[PDB]
Every structure is written in C-alpha cells, then in structure tokens.
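Hi again,

Forgot to attach this to my earlier email, sorry! This is the prediction with hydroxide ion bound. I've pasted everything inline since the attachment limit keeps bouncing my files.
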Amino acid sequence: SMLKREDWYDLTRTTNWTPKYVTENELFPEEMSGARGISMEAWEKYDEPYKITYPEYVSIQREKDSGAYSIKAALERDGFVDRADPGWVSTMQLHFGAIALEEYAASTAEARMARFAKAPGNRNMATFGMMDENRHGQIQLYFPYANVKRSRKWDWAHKAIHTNEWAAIAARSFFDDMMMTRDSVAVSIMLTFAFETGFCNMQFLGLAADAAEAGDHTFASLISSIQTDESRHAQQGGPSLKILVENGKKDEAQQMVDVAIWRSWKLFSVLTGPIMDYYTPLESRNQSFKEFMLEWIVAQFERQLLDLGLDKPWYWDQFMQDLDETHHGMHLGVWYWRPTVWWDPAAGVSPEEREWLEEKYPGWNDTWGQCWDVITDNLVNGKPELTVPETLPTICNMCNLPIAHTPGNKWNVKDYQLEYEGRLYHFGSEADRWCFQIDPERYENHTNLVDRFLKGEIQPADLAGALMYMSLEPGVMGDDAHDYEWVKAYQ
Amino acid sequence: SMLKREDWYDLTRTTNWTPKYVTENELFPEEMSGARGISMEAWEKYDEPYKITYPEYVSIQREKDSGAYSIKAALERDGFVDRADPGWVSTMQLHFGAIALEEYAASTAEARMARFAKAPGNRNMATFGMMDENRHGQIQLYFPYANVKRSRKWDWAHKAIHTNEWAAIAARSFFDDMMMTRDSVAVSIMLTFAFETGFCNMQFLGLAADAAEAGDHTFASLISSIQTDESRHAQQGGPSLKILVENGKKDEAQQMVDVAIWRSWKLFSVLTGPIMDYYTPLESRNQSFKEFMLEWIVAQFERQLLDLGLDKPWYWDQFMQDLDETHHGMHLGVWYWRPTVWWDPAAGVSPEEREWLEEKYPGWNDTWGQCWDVITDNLVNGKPELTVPETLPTICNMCNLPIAHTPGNKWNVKDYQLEYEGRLYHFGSEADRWCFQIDPERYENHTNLVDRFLKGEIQPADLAGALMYMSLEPGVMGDDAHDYEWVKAYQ
Amino acid sequence: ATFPIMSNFERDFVIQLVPVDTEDTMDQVAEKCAYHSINRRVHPQPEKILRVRRHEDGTLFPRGMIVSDAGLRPTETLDIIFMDN
Amino acid sequence: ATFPIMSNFERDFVIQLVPVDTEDTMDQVAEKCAYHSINRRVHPQPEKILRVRRHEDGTLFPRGMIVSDAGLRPTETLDIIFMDN
Amino acid sequence: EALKPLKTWSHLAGNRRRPSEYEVVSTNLHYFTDNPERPWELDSNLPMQTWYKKYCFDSPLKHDDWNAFRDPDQLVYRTYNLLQDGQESYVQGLFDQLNDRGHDQMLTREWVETLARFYTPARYLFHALQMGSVYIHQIAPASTITNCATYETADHLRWLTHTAYRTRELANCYPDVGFGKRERDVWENDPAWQGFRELIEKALIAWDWGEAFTAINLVTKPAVEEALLQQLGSLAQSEGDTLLGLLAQAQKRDAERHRRWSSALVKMALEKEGNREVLQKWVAKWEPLADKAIEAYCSALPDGENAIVEAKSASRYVRQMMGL
Amino acid sequence: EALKPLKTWSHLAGNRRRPSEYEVVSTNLHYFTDNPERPWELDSNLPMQTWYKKYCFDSPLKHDDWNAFRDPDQLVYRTYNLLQDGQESYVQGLFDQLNDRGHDQMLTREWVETLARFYTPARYLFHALQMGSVYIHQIAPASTITNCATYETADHLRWLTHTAYRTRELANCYPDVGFGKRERDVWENDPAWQGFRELIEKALIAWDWGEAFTAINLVTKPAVEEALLQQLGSLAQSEGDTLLGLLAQAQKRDAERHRRWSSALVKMALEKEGNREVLQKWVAKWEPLADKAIEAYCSALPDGENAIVEAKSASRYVRQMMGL
Ligand SMILES: [Fe+3]
Ligand SMILES: [Fe+3]
Ligand SMILES: [Fe+3]
Ligand SMILES: [Fe+3]
Ligand SMILES: [O-]
Ligand SMILES: [O-]
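Structure tokens for the complex follow:
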C-alpha cells in the first residue's frame, strides 16, 4: 500500500536548519533573499495553496508533453501555417520572438527563489517552477522551429532577444527588472503574483481560444497545455505577500505590486492589445481588448488585492481610462514603424473594422481615425512613402515603448519629463516616471535606443544604420500583413 | 542490465508438450485446429517474421492510445463534423457501421488461433492479435460515439451488425465465412493473409490520407494509428502457407487463398470502390479505385503469391477486367436503393465528375452514363419518384450483394445460376458460384434477403415491411448526400 | 397464379425481382418488367418489341406463350430484350 | 548648430525626435517638425500658423526667436501647435 | 417522425447514469447470440454452428441477460495498458537492477537446483492457462464476459514472458544446469508436476463455456496461484531469492484481479435458482484434481506438508467467499 | 537580396549533421552573456549586475565558447520526464509492494535505530544539494551547462522526496522512535553529521560559478553519494533492509548521470591551458572537508574504518578519471 499525500507532504519542506559553520546572512545574502529582517521562523508560516510532489509532477507532465507533441506531429503535413490568415501568422511570429527566451530565462528567476528563499515551501515550489519554464522555453522553441524553411522571420523565435531591435529591448527591460535582477521574495511578488497570476494565466486562455477560432490546432494545444502549468508556480507570490503584511511591511509589498502591475500592463498594451483589436479578423472578435481587460484581469486584481489586505494602486483610475487609448497608440506606432519589427503588422482599419472600433470605443473615428484617414488617402493616392517614417519616435525611459496617446479632436499626448543629475529623461505616463523616481539607482545609466542614437552609438547615424544595429534586414523587416488589400475598399 | 530480445525470445514460444492425460486430437480437435495430418513437430518450424514481447507491446501501445485519444480531445470542440463535405460524413457513417463490431469479432477469430494452433509461435502472435482487435473494436466505438447527438445514423456504429439490413448481412456473410467459422490454420490464411495483409493494410493507408485531404484530423489519426497495428497480426498466414506447401498441401492452401481473395474483393467493391470514385470530392481524387487496386493491391498479391510458391487464382483475368465494372454497379445499386442503407449516398455524376470518370474509364458515359442519364432527366423533370425503387434487386447467394454489371451499349449483366437439391440459387459472378460449389454444405440452407422475402419471412411482404425487417426508419434511411445539389448543373 | 421471376432488362445494370402471373403472356411479363426499368434507368425504344428469353440457355419464348406453359423454375432469370417482332 | 528636440505635433499621436539647428527660428523649427507629421498623420491647416511652445511649462516662443536664445535642454520636448498668428 | 438523435447508444438509452467509457466500448457486442438457432451468417449445420449451439447456448449455466455483466475493475484496452505498463516498469526495473547487483550469483547451489525443478518449468503451466483463458474468451455468451477473459489471457502471457526471460538469465548464470533445455522433460516426467499437468490437460477440453470458466477460473487457477505464486514465492524469499519473492507477489496482483471478476460472475449467476447447484457440481468434479495437483507439487517442496495444508485452504477460501 | 529562409536556426547553420531536438531547444539561450559590461537591461551598477560580472564573467575557469557544451546524455524536459517516470514507477512499485509484504515490520530494533541516525536526517543534506545544484543553474555561463544543473536539481528533490516519504512510513511503523521529529537535532548536533554539514554549509556560499561546480559537483557529491548511497546502502542490504538497499541503488543511477555531465564539463575545460591547475586548486581547497565528512559519518557506522577507506577511494576515483 501507499501513503496519502497529506500524511507526509510536510516532511518534503521541513528543510530549514540553523547554520553553524557560516552565518545566516552569509548563506542567505539579503540582496538575493530579501528576507527583510523577518526571521527564518516567520518565513516558515509560508503555505503554498496548490501542492504537488515529485512523482505526481513527472507523471502528469510526461502526459502533457505526450499529448502536445503528438498533436503537433499529426497536423504537421497539413501545413495550416501556409494558409492561415496573415494576421494570425504574424501573431505567432510576435509571440515566439518576444517570449520563448524570456520563458527560459524565468527558470533562473525560479532558481533564484529555489536557492535563496527562506520559506522551505517556496524553495520546493520554485524547483517545480524552474522545471516548468524549462519546458516552456524548450517547447516554444521546438514548435516554431517547424517553420524555419518558410521564412527567416521564424528564426527570430531564437534570435529576437539576442538583438537590439526596440521591441526586444522593451521585453528585456521588463523581464530583467521583474525577475532577473530582484531578490527572491521580490521575484515571488513581482513575477509570480503580479505578472503571472495577474496577466499570463488569462492571456494564455484567451490566446488558446483564438488559436482554435483561427483554425490553428497545433498552436491552441501548445498554448493551452502551457497554460495548465501556470498556477502551480504562479501561486508563489500570494503567501509571500501575507507574510510581509503580517510583519511590519504592507508598504514595501504595496510598492512592489504597484510597480510590477504598471510595468506588466505597459508590455501587455503593445504585445496583446494590438493583436486583439486589429490583427484577429473581425468575425472572430469575441470581445475588445478593453472588454477583456475589465472582465478577466482588472477585477481579479481588486479581488486578489482585497483578500491580501492590500490597496488598489494609486494609478488605478488613470489605468482604467488608458484602456481606451494606449494600445491604439502602440498599434499605430508598430504599424507605422513596421520595418522595425520582425513580424508583418495588420493595419485593421477597413470600413467594417472601423465600425467595430467605433462601437467598442465611442470617439475612435474622431481621434485615432484621422491619422488613419491620412495614411489611407496617401495609399489610395499612390504615395506609400508617407506611410513609413524618416525619424525615430521618442522612447519612454522606463517601458522603452514610444510615448504615444490620443490624436485628432481630443489631442492629448503628454511627456512626463524629468531632469536627474544633468540628464533629461522622457516618460510615456505618470506611473512610468514614478517607477524611476522611487528607485533612480536601478535605472539611471540605462540608455534607450534614442539615447543611443543621440549619443553616437549607432553608426552610420541614419535609419539604415539603426536597422543594422537592430539586426533587421530585408526579409525580416515588417510590412503590411495583408499587403495593402484593405486599401481597395477605398480604391 | 537487461538481456537482448533475441537472446531469450525463443523461450516465449517453447510451449509445445506431448499430452498424456488426454490425447493430441482431444486437446487439438481438427475442426478447431486444422493441423491437417501435419505433425506437432512440423508446425514448430513456424517462424513469425515480426517479433514482439509483452513489455514492448503494452509500452508501444500505451503510447499509440495516448496520442490518438489526445488528438481526439483537442479537436472535439471544433466540430469538424458539422461542416465536412457530406460525402465524407457518409464515408464515416458507412465505415463505423460496417466494421466496428467485425473488428471486435476478429478478436475471437484471433483467440481461435491462440487456443487451437499447433504452431507455438502462432499462438502467441494471436494473443497479441486478439489484443489488437480488442483495441480496434473499442476505439472505433469510442470515436463515432462523439456524434450520437448529431444524428441517429451514428448509433449504427453499434447497431448495424445487430440488424438484417442487407449490407450488414453482406458484412457478416464475409466475416463469418473468413474468420468465425473456420479452423485455426484456415483463419490464419483466409483472414490474416488474404484479407488483412491483402487489402486492409493498404486500404487503411489510403483511408488515412483521405481523412487528411478532407480536413478530418481526428479520423486520419484514428485510422492511421489502427493501421500501424495491422502487420503485427496480419503476418500470421504467411508461415502457415509455407508449412502447407512444404508438406503435402499446396492445393488445400491454394483453394483457401482463391476463396478468401474473391470474397474480400467483392466486399471491397461495395464498401470502398464507391467511395473512392464518387464520394470523395473531385479535386481530392488522387487516383481511381482501379488505379489504386492495380498499384497497391494486385501486384502485392502476385509478389506474395510467387514468394510463397503459390499460383495466381484461376479467376485473375476476369478479376482484372472487373476493376472496370463492379464497383460502378455497386455504387449505382446503393445510390438507387439508398433508403436501404444507414448513410446518405453521393451520386457523384455532376458534369465535371462525369468527365473524370470518362478518363479513368473509357466507355463510362456510353455504359454506366445512360442509367444516370435517365435518373438525371427525371430529376430535372420533377419526377423524383422514378429514382427510388419499387422492388428488390436479385441478391447473389454467396456475396449477398446485388447481381449487377455493365449497362448501356455494352450491356453485359449475367447470372451464374445453379440448381442444387431442388433449390435455385443466384450468383453475381462465376467465382461466387464456384465458392458454393467447392463446399456446398457450408452454404446450402443460408437464405439471402430475397429468399426470405419470397419465403414468407418478411411481413407485411411489401417494401415498408422489408424496411422494418432491416430495422430502418425515417431519420436513418439513406438519401442523396448533397440533397440533389449536383442536379442544378442540368437545371 | 402469382409467380416470382428475375428480370435482366436489356441495357439496365441489375437483375431485379419481378412477381408475374402464371396466366400472363410474355408480352404481359415484359410489361411488368419494363415498369421497373423503362424511364428509371433505360430509355424507351418505341420502334422495338419487348421479347422474353430464358437467361440460362437463351430460349426465346413467343410473345403469346403464357407463364404456365413456359416450364420455368420459381425465380428463374429472364432476359427482357429489344427486338423488331 | 545641430540640436535634438522632441516634437509633440498637434493632433498627431506620438512625440518624435527632430534634429533642428541652433540658428533656426521657431517658424523653421515648426517647418522641420511638420515634415514628420503634416500629410503623414495630420491634415494641413492652411488658415493656421504653426507656433512653437515649451512642453513642460507651456511657454510660447515668438515665431522669430532662434533656438540658441530659447534656453532649451538637448532633447527638450516641444508642442507644435495651430494658431492664428 | 424522423428518429431523434439519442444521448448515448440506443441499447443504453434511459439509464439514469451517463454511460462510462467502459460501458460505451464493451457492451452488447457479440452478434452470434442474435439467432441461437443459426449463430453465424452461413449454413446452420456447419461444425462451428454446432460447436456454439452445444457449448454456449446449451450450457446448464443460465441467465436471461448475460449482456448485463460488468467487470468490477472496468478494464478497457486503454486502461489495461496504463495499468500493465506501470507494473511492467516496476518488474523490468527489478530485473535490470538486481542483475546490476549480481543477485543471481548470491543464490546457493541447492536453491538453483530448486529453481530448475519448481520454477523454470512453469512456462508450460502458464502457457496452458493462457490457452485456457483464451478459450473462455471465444465461447462466453457476452462481450463483457469475453473481455475479462481477453485481459486475463494477456496476463497469463505476461507470466510466461517473465519466466521465459528469467530462465535465460538463470541459464547464463549457471550454464551447467540445463535451464531452458530441460523444462519439457520436468513438466512431462517429474512427479511433482504430473498433478497439475493432468488437472490442466483435462481442463483444456472442457468445452462448455460455464464449465471452462469453472474449471480454469474457479478451480485450476487458485490452485496454480497458491502453489506457484504464494508457496514457491515465500519459500523463495526465505531462501534469499529476493527477485522471485517479489516477481511472484507482482503476478499475484494480476491473479487477484482475475478473482474479482470471477467472483462478480458467480454473484450474477446466483441470481437464477439452480446455478449454485450447477457450479457446485462442476467444483466437486474438478477439485479432487486440484487437490492432487497441490499435493504432488507442494509435498516435494521443503516443509511440504504445511505448504500442502495452506495452499489447500487458501484456494478453497476463494470459492467459499463467492458463496460456493 | 531578401534574407533566405534557413535550414535550422541561424546560430546552428552549416553543421554537417541536422541538429538534434536537444540542440534545437537547448543551445545559445542565455542572453545576459551578450554584454559582459552590462548583462541586464538596467542600470549597470545594480547589485545583480555586480553579482554576475564577479561570479560568472570573472571566474578563473575560462573558455572562449561555453555555448559549445553538450550534455553527454542530451536531456531535454520531455526526455527527462520519460526517463524519471520510468524510474519512479519502479521506486513507487517497491514502496507499495514491500509495504504490502510487511517489510518495515521485519527489521530489527538495532537497525531501526540506525535508520533514525544514519538515514532519516539525509532530508537535510539532500535538500542542501538541491539548493547547491540550483545555484549552479542560475550562474553558469551557458544554457547547456544550466540545463544539466536544472535536471540534476530535480533529482536532488527526488531523493529528498523518497526520504520524506519513507520517514513517514518509518514513523507509522515505530511511533516511539521520533522519525520525522528528530532529524533536525541529529543533522545539527550529531558528530557523525557535522563533517558533511560543515562541507555543505561552506560549499553553499562559494559564489563563483566554477568554484560552485567544483565544490558541489566534483567534491561534495561524490563524497555524499559514496557515504549515503554506496556505504549505507550495502550495509542496509546486509542488515535485511532490502528496500533501502534498492532505493539507494536506484538514486545512484541519478548520481552517475550527474557525474557523466560533470566529467564532460571538465573534459571541455581542459581544452584551455590553465584550467586543470584552476580546478586542481579548488579540489585541494575542498577535499579535506570531504575527507572529514566521510570520516565523521562512516566511522560511526559498523565496520567504520573500512567504509572510510572505500568511500575515500571511490570518490577520489571520480576525479582521477576526469584527469584531475
Ligand atoms: Fe511559463
Ligand atoms: Fe510561468
Ligand atoms: Fe483490426
Ligand atoms: Fe486486423
Ligand atoms: O508559465
Ligand atoms: O487490424
């Protein structure tokens, strides 16, 4: 016979002891552990709510792979990819380049907690964490690798994060701040709680429904398998937060949550928002990015935050409002700067699409619509050259995304500038500036792409030079996803 | 460390012994074993060419199921079935009803060999055989069961072989003669060699390519998984044939092969031929049923038969010729008698289709084409009632299929009748009649549907009565697969 | 008087079961067969006469012979063929 | 004489980097900005005058002031706005 | 009315409970029971027609609805390979690892000799059960009864397989013993085997389905299991053979499952008056060969008489618990 | 020219051999090694920037191309769970079946006492290796080096897991012993452990990647494996503990794989003059704690002095074979 899990589980995490041959601080350096003057004894109240042991893990996870890898082999000759909507293909190319290596990087972020947490329970969970993102990174390399021979852009699933292409830098700037360069307790809050629990879990659900709705099985199955792994490790920040609140530290914990949520949101507004509202074809649009945010992300945050004993972040109302705006900015920047990404962006402003946009966002045609009016006239009039750029946008110094916002009859583009030790910095929002201010030493001497341009680091110091510097060449450089087909609606 | 398979494999089949407490003939009754006066010693030269042992089997087969069952769960919400070509749906409905239970029945046919073969090697192979068809029958029930709620016709995957619907009787009449009611050595020749090796193995390959070509993954994966199981048991008749030839019995073995191949072919001409040439849409037609027969079935037979030391069956030239004809007959009968099957047959005689038919079969429009000319005129002229029947076709007394053949300017329909002990029998071909003649006691008092009709066993003795007797009702009764859409081409 | 036969109608593709009467002439046998073949799958040939022939050995019955006199086995197969006469 | 600024063009959606000259008047700053905005994403307004304003505190420079005299930080953000005058 | 689409298969409709995977792929599948007067779609006087009329339909063991039988373990092919691939990893793990550790080398010369006599030659008795269970498959009156016999037969092949494999490992380690060459003469001529061999040779021509169930399922198997698995196995362990002690306990898991379904079958038979008496006569006719089988084998073992008393009582126990 | 589609990933192009699954999902993946002067996309003076400049880039253990490293076993996540789900079926099979057979009940009072002292408290040393191997993961210079440390860390969690589980089975069977309550005081205060505990506590703050590899990979692990698996394991078997004899041999499979990749790593380091000397100094600084660890533990065992001599020589053997 076999024991019941609950009878021996506790022994798997009864692993703390009192060092003798080295000191506690030596073995758990504050800069790696972030124990924050709360004692080993007090970190032991840490109780993961979802439990799993080694044999359960290797057995359930052997089954998940068998499934996903068999679905993939079975659909491979069919080539769904050669006849997918080109906005879908693009969604895949963007996802693979932005995330595959950052998934892999998250195994180190998990390893940080696995070695340096003072919660025995956190260390073991993070071991499984560390395994999970080993899987995510490898399966997200193995999948896109199917498509290398169809287009160099698929090589970006591996290369992106090795380049200085601006989107890759916005990715690293996020990931590194959240999970690579923070102490263990911080990583548990800022990554597993704010980003993973806060955003990934739902995002991957929506993303899996869309693959299916697009007719892309392989991908639906991949995403939705990865998604079933999430909460096993995502749950880790929860108990950390209880512990900080119950000891002196509600404000340290608040402040970390505040920063991680904004940072997340900004990434999400360029990586996800454009996709929902412009790339997925009209007849598949199930809800708007703003709808999706309100229903599946934002209320889960207030629920979580109330249960933890924390407050809504000071920037909450602004954030609500920005659901109307930011991602429309980021889409327009990405489309407009399209030879600077490695995917083909989709304009998504055919008349039917503009109607949809107008009911999801009263005011759209009056604001966002004008810029697209002008882009459209030009295209109809055989002047395509006024629809690609000749300069750089200003890049925010915190999110590394362009500082953009409401155009047209409600013009409202603002720059939250700051002079700090003889340098001028630019911020796309009030919250982005405040992330720098509460912790200037963490960001001072970082330079965004524009900074580098201005500084002399990009040579030749023109657009062709910046292309080479970002590792982009013809064949990889983005262009209009439908090749300007939506333009015939206007003639 | 672990041994190598080849080092101990022989011991798994060193299981013959000399009975003492009962006699050899008691323990191996001739009527079940068919040892045919060849000694236990001589049956021991039996050497399966593909070997497998229990742990290899349960391990490779656990993987095949994991795959197939995961593909199925992953594609289920997508409902490919609700939007498949209705000729494809029909192909599925026919396959499931004709075969699911006959697969299951083949596990007993395998069990026959497993208990009663004198070849130790055959008994163990047949154990795995017996396992294989346990799988085939169960997975072919579990799959179609997905679709019960969409149409009663899917209930036929279970019910068909429990009814007296004429196609079900043609199925049992085949299966029982080949594998349920023969001695062990016979089953090994007639089922595993002639039908499985001869026809299934290739058929399932073609069928799997077609599922894929139709956009039906689930089914492609199901069929092509089952197909990877085939040759493990199909190989069993091969070594039996060597043994019979090397002892006195080339003619007993010949005669069994002859009978099984004809019987197979007839089944295949109604179950497969119509499907290839009329149900699968034109643009998916990869080759003709005759092409497929010549390349993938017929030459494999001459190769096999030459290697075994056997001859081409006396009926070979006729058989070649009939590749031009029979399945066109069976399709026309099934379409014409369509409320007597449980699937919706596809007419497949749109103009484009008739052109295709004409190049695959010079002479088609002149022969087969006329009948369809008349059916078509009637349909164009609003007289649909002259395109369904008012009587029964004559049924062949061996294959239980209608006696049909070349119409039009090459009229050639023949009936190979035989008077035997005061009864008149009907045969669809010279070979069908000869199957009865070489072994009249095996078939005498069987009665085909017409016989039953004529005899008083069907009451009321009219068409509505025959419908009830065949267990068919509105909702199950076949009609035109495209609902007469191909008729608008003619107005 | 009711008597089953198997109709092999000229230019059709399939033998069918046709109940005739023992009193029927060949001409009335031919009419009962045509009903299951002419205008379903064979084209009328109105400058032609439907003759009845025994399938097995090719014996031609006169238009006017009745079934009783024909020496047929129940269920015997019959060619229904297009002739002048 | 080459001097970088950040152009926030009225009714555009995005601040852009624009190299001006230290010798340029506001009017010539405004012309260099418009090049990246008028007829790409903003509609000409020819009954209007492009004025240059400091973004941070809303100071309006005269059409005629040159960049050298403006007291600007490299990379300073500037509203380019539609006025009469 | 067109016939409405159904919730499950027609023969299962209105059940209260949604049918399990198990019900869905296992029930009401034999068709030869349609027409008792003509089971196969051929001439009704073929030998095979006769064989099934006599040995399946005229069985004295009777029930109005044999299709109502349900395997208490609910095995289907898919869950059968999940289960046995687990147990096979365990058993192939024991093989690999004890080999690594030189376990065959640690056994004494006396014990090796005992393996050649009492263990090896089981390849015959376990193949004979395989033939025995596979005969039950092809004559039982319902597909749910056939399937238990399907999976059981695959087990008995399993136990032959283990034995085939260790016999090679034993021949490589003691090439002078004849492991692998001599089992057939032992099985044929050794008095310790002649009891079993007689029991099983006679059971193998019991053609009546209910009699085959009883002879193999109820009488021969508990006797083979108590003698070869329980008694040789704990003697094995007591002599230092840790591998065989564990292997046999591993096989006894299969055997216990064969008993769970046999027991269900008998519970179901006892729903019709007459059946208990029918089974009891069958048990009385066969049990004395089982007695002899246990006596001739266990008594040639160490502590023989006591192995005799415990095999006898533990196999009777199997039937006593079904109410026989 | 538009850039042409490639045959494999750009960093693998023109290799002769089609890249394996392994190469495809494991190579060239760390990006913090892009810019040694600023590894992370933030301010270059953050503590974490410092930590990696110092402990990864200024390691004295040097190679021009650490991304060329290849795990001789080529584990990826998918084939890691295939392998360990096999071994876990085997080990959970042993647990289940020996429990069934009352094996814990057959051990002597003396032996039980020995398990409380020499076996139980390993939950600490094996969690400490888990922390040790997981530190190697997050500082190694290449993703192919990190991944070996990934899978190795999951093993060390595995061995903690086994021990957590048996310790419960032991506490249920001998509730008076303190199994489960006392391990922390033994690990903390028992002289037999203080050698190991010192060895590992000091190894856990060796921050330099090459020094962590060596201290954990080359010196602490063969010493822990020879003492706790080889020596306690064959003492176990000799005392009747068949379960622990087999469990430990089961874990030693993991450990041997950790040695295969460690050995590959060192083969690769020795391609640059200086590295052998660098590794040898590291070995000389740490080995005397290993000596002490083996001495304090093995000498408190039966036949102590001999267990000391064999653990010592078999762990030195591990390094001698890599050429150190
Ligand atoms: Fe992940
Ligand atoms: Fe994650
Ligand atoms: Fe099959
Ligand atoms: Fe088969
Ligand atoms: O994840
Ligand atoms: O098969």
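Strands of chain C lie at 2-9, 16-21, 49-54, 77-83. The pocket of fe (iii) ion (ligand 3) is lined by residues B 103, 106, 132-133, 136 (CB under 6 Å).

That should be everything now.

G.
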